[PDB]
Design a protein around this nucleic acid. Structure first.
Lengths: 84, 98, 106, 513, 94, 92, 99, 101, 105
DNA sequence: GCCATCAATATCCACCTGCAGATTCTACCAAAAGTGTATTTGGAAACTGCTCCATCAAAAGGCATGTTCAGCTGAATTCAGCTGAACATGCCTTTTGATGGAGCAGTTTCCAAATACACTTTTGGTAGAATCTGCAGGTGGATATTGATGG
DNA sequence: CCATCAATATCCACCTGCAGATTCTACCAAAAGTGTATTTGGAAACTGCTCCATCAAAAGGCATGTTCAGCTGAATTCAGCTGAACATGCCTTTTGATGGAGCAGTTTCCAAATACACTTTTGGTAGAATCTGCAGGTGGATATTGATGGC
C-alpha cells in the first residue's frame, strides 16, 4: 500500500472553527486550529492502538466497528449505535 | 456595503451547529489520517466503513465536549477568545495530561 | 403453555436474558428471580427513555424518533444524564446552550 | 474518749480530703434537687458524706472507731452503687477507698485494735436439695424457701425470687474485760481452744501469765512413717538452706483407709463378664498435709491425695501408686524456696513407696479450671494459675531432680509408655478412682484410642521406680464442703491462718480414733 | 449466516405501549440496543462483583436489586426496586 | 447518673461546621494553595459533604446486603473502587 | 519596638513546604467520626463504624480534597490570580464532570 | 478441641511473596506493615483489572477459554510501550521455562 | 516434585493464581500458562515498584519502606504515575510542588 | 532603587537513645499444591462460499483557500478600597486509655431452592415481495434581526 | 439617543420524489418451558468471641481580634488578531463499476483443559524472645528573610 502522510492538515481551519462553534466558542485564536489538531491526533493514536490490538487479538487484518466500540468503552468514552 | 458586527455571524453559526447533528468534520481526511497512523502502528490493515464512522463521531464528541470545557475555562479568565492554555488546563483537570 | 416472561407480566424475554446471564460468566449459578428483575429494570429504563424521546420528537413536530430525539431526552433528564454522562450518542449532537456572556453586550 | 478518737482519725480523713478532684463531689451531702437526681433517695437509703463525718467526729458521737470505719465503707458502697462504674463518682470513690486502705492501718494499729479494714467474705455459694447432686449457681436467679436451682423445681408461687449477690461479714468477738470489738481471724481466738473467752493481750499484760499453749496444733497430730520421712526431708533441706525467714514444717497423714474401685458398667460388660479381670480392684487411700510455722502459728500450705494398689491387687493395677489430687498455697516463707520445698515432699513420697516395694507411679498433671478448688477452698485472687505447659515443665523438673538423686529410675508420658510396652487392648490401662481414662473408655464404648493418648500425651506422667479413720478428710469433697459452709478461706495470710487453725481443731476433736 | 439477536421487537412493543403513534428510525433502534446492552452489562457486572464480595456464587434478586440501587440514582432506583419486587412476586405467585 | 454528665456539652456547632477551618487551611497548604478567600472554607465543607454521600452511602448500601449494620473497611474500599477513587492499605 | 513580623506569603510558603513534605492526617479525628456517623444515620439508623473504615474514609476524603485543591489553584493562577475563588472550584468540579 | 477459639480466619494475602521480591531487589531494606498492605492492595487490584481484561477479550471473540494470547493482548492494552515490552519479555521467559520444565 | 512457581522460576504462587482465576468467574476454562504469566507480570511490576521505593528510601536516608516512599516512587515514574493516577494512596502525602507565581520575587 | 549585612527562626543535619514495630527461630496442620489417570472438548488446520473491503472514472458545486479592512478584544499600566496574611491571646476541644454488652463470626439441621438434561412446543430472527409513509429538499413570502442611515 | 428604515437571515407552510419505516407469507433452527432426577446455597437456631459505643483524664492544639502589606478588580489606553466579506478555485460527493484480498461457514480431530483420587509441602496462625528504624529530645547553627541602615 502507498505510504501516505501529512494529512493532519486535512482537518481544515473552517472545520475546527465549526467544531468550536458547536461547542459554544465565539472567538478562536490562530494557533488553536493546529494545537487542537495535535490533541485530536493524540486521541487518534490512542484509540486506534487499542482498536488495532483488539483486532490483532482476533487474528484479523480488518478493523471492525465492534472493536472500535470495545476501545471506546475501555477508554471511558462508550459509543452507541455501532454495536455493543 | 452591508456588514455585520464581529461575533454576530459567529453566534448565528453557533445556534446553527448546535441545532443540527450531522458529522462536522469531512470524512476522507479523517480516513486518511487514521490509515496513516494505523500503518504507523501496523501495516496492511483494513477498515470498515462503520468503524470509520464510529471513530469520526467519537472524535467529534470528544472535541466538542473539550470545546464547552474550553469556553468555560476561557470565560473563567474574563475572556471570550480561546487560547491553548485554556484546554491545557481543562485536560490537566480532566487528567489527560497530568 | 405459559412463558416465564408472560408469567411475570413483562415485555422483555426472561429466557433470553437469563441465557445471556449464564453465558456472561457472572457466577457458577443464577437465581430464578434475577432475570425477571433484570428484564423489569431494562423495560422500565427503555420505557422512560422512549417516552422522553417521543415527547422531544413531538416538541420538534416529528413523529419518528431519531438519535437527535434520544440525545435531547437523555440530556434534559438530569438523572438519565448522570446515567449516560460518559457515553456518546451517535448522531445526537449537543443541547442548544449559549452563555449569557456570549450574547451581545450592548 | 472523743479527743483520742479525733486526734487519731483526722490524719486519714484529711489525707482523703487532699485527693483532688476525686474528693470534690464528696465535700457536701448529695442534693437531688441541685444535682437533678430525684432517684438518689430511692436507691441510697442512708446517705452520708465527708462533712457529716467531720461534724460527727467534732461532736464526739463515736465511742469506738469501728463505727467510723463502717460509715466510711458504707458511703463508699453507696457511691459505687448509685453511680455507674464508668462515671466520675465511681472511680473517684475507688481512688478515695484506695487512699483509705493505704492510710487507715498505721493509725488504727496504734489505738489498740488489730487492723482498720472492713472484711467481707466471698459470696457463699449454696447447694441444691431436690437433686442432691447439683448446686446453686452464683450471680443468677435462684429459688429458696425458709434452696433449689432454676431447673430443679420445673420438673406453687410461694417461692421467693432473688439473685445470688449477698456477702457474709467477718465474725466479731468482744473481750470479756475491755469489751473492744475485734476480728476473730485477726486475733486467732477460737471458743473450743479457749473456753474462758477472748482476752486481749493488753489485759494479759496486766496479769503476767500469757496465753496458754494451744494443744490443737499440727505438731501433736498423730505421726506416721511416711509423714515423718517427708517432714524429716523437708526440715533437712531447710536446714541446709538455713533461710532466716524459713520455719519448721510439719507433715502429717490425717486420714488413711482401704477402698475399692468398681469397674464402670460399659467396661464391666466388655471385660469383667468374660472373667479376665475382677469386678473391683482394692487399694489404700491416704491424705497428707503440710503445715509451716509462720508468725508463731501453723499455716497449711500443701495438700495431696494418693491411691495405692498393693501387690495383691489384680493386674494391671498391681503394685502401683497414683496421685489423685494436688493442691498448695503460695504463702510459704520464703517464696524462693517454696517451689523447692514442694519437690522435697513429692520426691520424698516417691522414694518412700520405692522403699515399700512399689514399682510404678502415675501423675495427672491437669491445671485446675477457674473457680474449681481441688482441696483448699477460696484460692487467693493473686495466685497465678500455671499454664499446662508450665505445669508439665514443673513436673519434668521434679522428675529430673529426683533422677539426679538416683531415686527415680525412669519417667515418660503415657503415650510413649504404651507404645514401648506394645499394648494392644484398652484393658491394660491402669484403673484409678475418678481418673480421666476410665471416663474416656466409657465414652468410647458408648459411641482411635491411641489418638486420644497422643492428644493428652503431655498431661499424664508414668514413673518407673524400679489406719487413721477420718471422715472429714476421706476425700476432697467433705473438706471443701465444710470449708465453704464455715467460710474457711485461704485467700489471705490471716484467713489462711484462721482456716488452718479451724481445720486442725476439727481434725483433733472430731476424729474417729 | 450466524444468528445475531437483538431487542428491536421488544423496544418496539414498549414504545407502542407508551406512544402508539410514534415511530423510530433504524439508527435510533441501534442506539437503543446499545444503551440497553450497556446498562445490562453494567448492572450485571455490579451484581457479579457484589456476589463475589460476599462469597456468593449465585445472582438472586437481592444483590441485583442492590446493584441497581448503586448505579441507578434516586427516583429511577425506587421505581426499579418497586417494579422488580412486583414482578418477582407475580412470577412466584403462579 | 450524677457528676460528669456535663462534659463538653457545647453542642452549638453545626455538623458541617465541625470540619475545623484550620484543617481546611492545612489541606490547602498540602494542595499548594498560597492565598485563600475568606468564605471558601464553608463551600469546601459542602463539597466534601457531597463526596461523603457520594461514597459512604454506596458502602452503606453494601452493609444491609451482608445482613450487617456495621460498615467495614472492605465496604469502604470497594465503595471507593466503584466510584473511581480506589484506596490501598484497607483491603485486609 | 515593632515585634518581628513576616511578610504575607513567606509563612504561607513555609506551610506549603511543611505540609507537602509530611504525610500525617490534617482533618481532626473526632469531628470526622461525628460527620460520618450523622451522614450514615441519614441513610440507615443505628449504624456501627470500624476504626479501619473511618481511617479509609478520612484518607480518601483528604486525598480528594487535596487534589481538587491543586485543581482549584491551577484554575486561580490561570486567571492571573493567587487567591482561590468560588468560580475556580466550580470550574474545577465542572471540568471533572462531578457537577 | 472442636470449635477452637484461637482462629479459623485464614486471610488470603501475598505478604511473604512481596517480602521475598523485596529481598531479591533490595536484600538490606526493610518494610512496614502499612506499606505491606499497600503492596497487597496494589497487586490485588492489578490482578482483578488484568483478569477482567482477559475475560472480556475471551468473551467478545466468542472464546470460552483464557489462554496465553488473551493475557498477552490484555497486557498490551493495559500497558504502554516500555512496561508492556518488559512484562511481555519476562512472561514469555517464564512460560518458556515452565514448558521446558 | 517441583512447584509450578519453581518450574517457572517465580516467587509468586502459580497455583494460588490459578485457583483465583477459577473462583473469579472470568472463564469456565483457564489455560495452563495464564497463571504463570499472571505471576510473572505481578512479579515484574512488584520488582520495579519496590526498586523505586528503595531508591526513594535511600535518598531519604531511610532503610524501611513507608507509604511516603511508595508515593514518591510511584509518582516520579510517569508510566507508574498513570498506573495509579486514578488511585488514592494512603499515608503518602503529596509531592513537593510549588507554582512559579507562588514563589517570591 | 541596590544591596551588605546585625538578628530571630524553622529547619538539615551530627547524634542518640528507647520503644512500637519490624525481624528471627521452633512447631502444627488444614489448605492448597503437585502428580496420576480417564474423560471431554475448544479450538487448530483445510477448503471453500461469500460480503464487503479496497481501488479506478468522472464532474461540478460545496465549501476550502487566500486576501483586505477594521471592531473591538486581548494585553499592558495605575491605583485605591479592601480582603485576607501574620501574630499574640485565651481556653477548649481533641486525643488517648479503660470498660460493659450489641452484634461479628463459628457449628449444625435441613428444606425450599438451585442445576443436568431429554423432549416438545412456542418463538424470534428473517429470505422475499408489496404497500404505506415521515420527512429530505426546493419555492415562495411573511417574519424577526442588525446595523446605521435621515435628523 | 430614540425613531424610522433598508439589507438580511429565519420561520414556516406547502408540495413533490423516494430510501427507509412498516405489514404479510412462509420458513426454521435456536431457544423456552414442563417434568424428573440430583445436588447444594443458605434459611434458621444456638453460641463464643470481637470490638464498638460510652466514659474518664491529659494535652495539643483551635477560635477572635488587631494591624497592615499586598492582592484584585475598576478604570484607562492601545497594538494588532481575528471576524466579516468577497473572489477564486479545490476537491468533493456521489453514482458506478470492478478484481480480489480477506471474513467467515463447514468438516475433522487432537493436544490441552477438567474431574476426581492420592500424596506432598507449606503458608497461616499463635507464643517467646531478640533486633532495630526512627520519632522525637537536646546541643549547635544556618540560610533567610524582614529590617536597620549606607550608598
Amino acid at each position: 500500500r502507498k505510504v501516505l502522510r501529512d494529512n493532519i492538515q486535512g482537518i481544515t481551519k473552517p472545520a475546527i472553527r465549526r467544531l468550536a462553534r458547536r461547542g459554544g466558542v465565539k472567538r478562536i485564536s490562530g494557533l488553536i486550529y493546529e494545537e487542537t489538531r495535535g490533541v485530536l491526533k493524540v486521541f487518534l493514536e490512542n484509540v486506534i492502538r487499542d482498536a488495532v490490538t483488539y483486532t490483532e487479538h482476533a487474528k484479523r487484518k480488518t478493523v471492525t466497528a465492534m472493536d472500535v466500540v470495545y476501545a471506546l468503552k475501555r477508554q471511558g468514552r462508550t459509543l452507541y449505535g455501532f454495536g455493543g | 456595503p452591508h456588514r455585520y458586527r464581529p461575533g454576530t455571524v459567529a453566534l448565528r453559526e453557533i445556534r446553527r451547529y448546535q441545532k443540527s447533528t450531522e458529522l462536522l468534520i469531512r470524512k476522507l481526511p479523517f480516513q486518511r489520517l487514521v490509515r496513516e497512523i494505523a500503518q504507523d502502528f501496523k501495516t496492511d490493515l483494513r477498515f470498515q466503513s462503520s468503524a470509520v464512522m464510529a471513530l469520526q463521531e467519537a472524535c467529534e464528541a470528544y472535541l466538542v465536549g473539550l470545546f464547552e470545557d474550553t469556553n468555560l475555562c476561557a470565560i473563567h479568565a474574563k475572556r471570550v477568545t480561546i487560547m491553548p492554555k485554556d484546554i491545557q488546563l481543562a485536560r490537566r483537570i480532566r487528567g489527560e495530561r497530568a | 403453555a405459559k412463558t416465564r416472561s408472560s408469567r411475570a407480566g413483562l415485555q422483555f424475554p426472561v429466557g433470553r436474558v437469563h441465557r445471556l446471564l449464564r453465558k456472561g460468566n457472572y457466577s457458577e449459578r443464577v437465581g430464578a428471580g434475577a432475570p425477571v428483575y433484570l428484564a423489569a429494570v431494562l423495560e422500565y429504563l427503555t420505557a422512560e427513555i422512549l417516552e422522553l424521546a417521543g415527547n422531544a420528537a413531538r416538541d420538534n413536530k416529528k413523529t419518528r424518533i431519531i438519535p437527535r430525539h434520544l440525545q435531547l431526552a437523555i440530556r434534559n433528564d438530569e438523572e438519565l444524564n448522570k446515567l449516560l454522562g460518559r457515553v456518546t450518542i451517535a448522531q445526537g449532537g449537543v443541547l442548544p446552550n449559549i452563555q449569557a456572556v456570549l450574547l451581545p453586550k450592548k | 474518749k472523743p479527743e483520742e478518737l479525733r486526734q487519731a482519725l483526722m490524719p486519714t480523713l484529711e489525707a482523703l480530703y487532699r485527693q483532688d478532684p476525686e474528693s470534690l463531689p464528696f465535700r457536701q451531702p448529695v442534693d437531688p434537687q441541685l444535682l437533678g437526681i430525684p432517684d438518689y433517695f430511692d436507691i441510697v437509703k442512708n446517705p452520708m458524706d465527708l462533712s457529716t463525718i467531720k461534724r460527727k467526729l467534732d461532736t464526739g458521737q463515736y465511742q469506738e472507731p469501728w463505727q467510723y470505719v463502717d460509715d466510711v465503707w458504707l458511703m463508699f458502697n453507696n457511691a459505687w452503687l448509685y453511680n455507674r462504674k464508668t462515671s466520675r463518682v465511681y472511680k473517684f470513690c475507688s481512688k478515695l477507698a484506695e487512699v483509705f486502705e493505704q492510710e487507715i492501718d498505721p493509725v488504727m494499729q496504734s489505738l489498740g485494735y488489730c487492723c482498720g479494714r472492713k472484711y467481707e467474705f466471698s459470696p457463699q455459694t449454696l447447694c441444691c436439695y431436690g437433686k442432691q447432686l447439683c448446686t446453686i449457681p452464683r450471680d443468677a436467679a435462684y429459688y429458696s424457701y425458709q434452696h433449689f436451682c432454676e431447673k430443679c423445681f420445673t420438673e406453687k408461687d410461694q417461692f421467693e425470687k432473688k439473685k445470688n449477690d449477698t456477702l457474709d461479714p467477718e465474725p466479731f468477738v468482744d473481750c470479756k474485760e475491755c469489751g473492744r470489738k475485734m476480728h476473730q481471724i485477726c486475733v486467732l481466738h477460737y471458743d473450743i481452744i479457749w473456753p474462758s473467752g477472748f482476752v486481749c493481750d493488753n489485759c494479759l499484760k496486766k496479769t503476767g501469765r500469757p496465753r496458754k499453749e494451744n494443744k490443737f496444733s499440727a505438731k501433736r497430730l498423730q505421726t506416721t512413717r511416711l509423714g515423718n520421712h517427708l517432714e524429716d526431708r523437708v526440715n533437712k533441706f531447710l536446714r541446709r538452706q538455713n533461710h532466716p525467714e524459713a520455719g519448721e514444717v510439719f507433715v502429717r497423714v490425717v486420714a488413711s483407709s482401704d477402698k475399692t474401685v468398681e469397674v464402670k458398667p460399659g467396661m464391666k460388660s466388655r471385660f469383667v463378664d468374660s472373667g479376665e479381670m475382677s469386678e473391683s480392684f482394692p487399694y489404700r487411700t491416704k491424705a497428707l498435709f503440710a503445715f509451716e510455722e509462720i508468725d508463731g502459728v501453723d499455716v497449711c500450705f500443701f495438700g495431696m491425695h494418693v491411691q495405692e494398689y498393693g501387690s495383691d491387687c489384680p493386674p494391671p493395677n498391681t503394685r502401683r501408686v497414683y496421685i489423685s489430687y494436688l493442691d498448695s498455697i503460695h504463702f510459704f516463707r520464703p517464696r524462693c524456696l517454696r517451689t523447692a520445698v514442694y519437690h522435697e515432699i513429692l520426691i520424698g513420697y516417691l522414694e518412700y513407696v520405692k522403699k515399700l516395694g512399689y514399682v510404678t507411679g502415675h501423675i495427672w498433671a491437669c491445671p485446675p479450671s477457674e473457680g474449681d478448688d481441688y482441696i483448699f477452698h477460696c484460692h487467693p485472687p493473686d495466685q497465678k494459675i500455671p499454664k499446662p505447659k508450665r505445669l508439665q515443665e514443673w513436673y519434668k523438673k521434679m522428675l529430673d531432680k529426683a533422677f539426679a538423686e538416683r531415686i527415680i529410675h525412669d519417667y515418660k508420658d503415657i503415650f510413649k509408655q504404651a507404645t514401648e510396652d506394645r499394648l494392644t487392648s484398652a484393658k491394660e490401662l491402669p484403673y484409678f478412682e475418678g481418673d480421666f481414662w476410665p471416663n474416656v473408655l466409657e465414652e468410647s464404648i458408648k459411641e482411635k484410642l491411641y489418638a486420644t493418648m497422643e492428644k493428652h500425651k503431655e498431661v499424664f506422667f508414668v514413673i518407673h521406680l524400679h489406719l487413721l479413720s477420718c471422715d472429714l478428710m476421706d476425700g476432697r469433697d467433705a473438706f471443701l464442703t465444710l470449708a465453704r459452709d464455715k467460710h474457711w478461706e485461704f485467700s489471705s495470710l490471716r484467713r489462711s491462718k484462721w482456716s488452718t487453725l479451724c481445720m486442725l481443731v476439727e481434725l483433733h476433736t472430731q476424729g474417729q480414733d | 449466516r450466524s444468528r445475531k439477536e437483538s431487542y428491536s421487537i421488544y423496544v418496539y412493543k414498549v414504545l407502542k405501549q407508551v406512544h402508539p403513534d410514534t415511530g423510530i428510525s433504524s439508527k435510533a433502534m441501534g442506539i437503543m440496543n446499545s444503551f440497553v446492552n450497556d446498562i445490562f452489562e453494567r448492572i450485571a457486572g455490579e451484581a457479579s462483583r457484589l456476589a463475589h464480595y460476599n462469597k456468593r456464587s449465585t445472582i438472586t434478586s437481592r444483590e441485583i436489586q442492590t446493584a441497581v440501587r448503586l448505579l441507578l440514582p434516586g427516583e429511577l432506583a425506587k421505581h426499579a426496586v418497586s417494579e422488580g419486587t412486583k414482578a418477582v412476586t407475580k412470577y412466584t405467585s403462579a
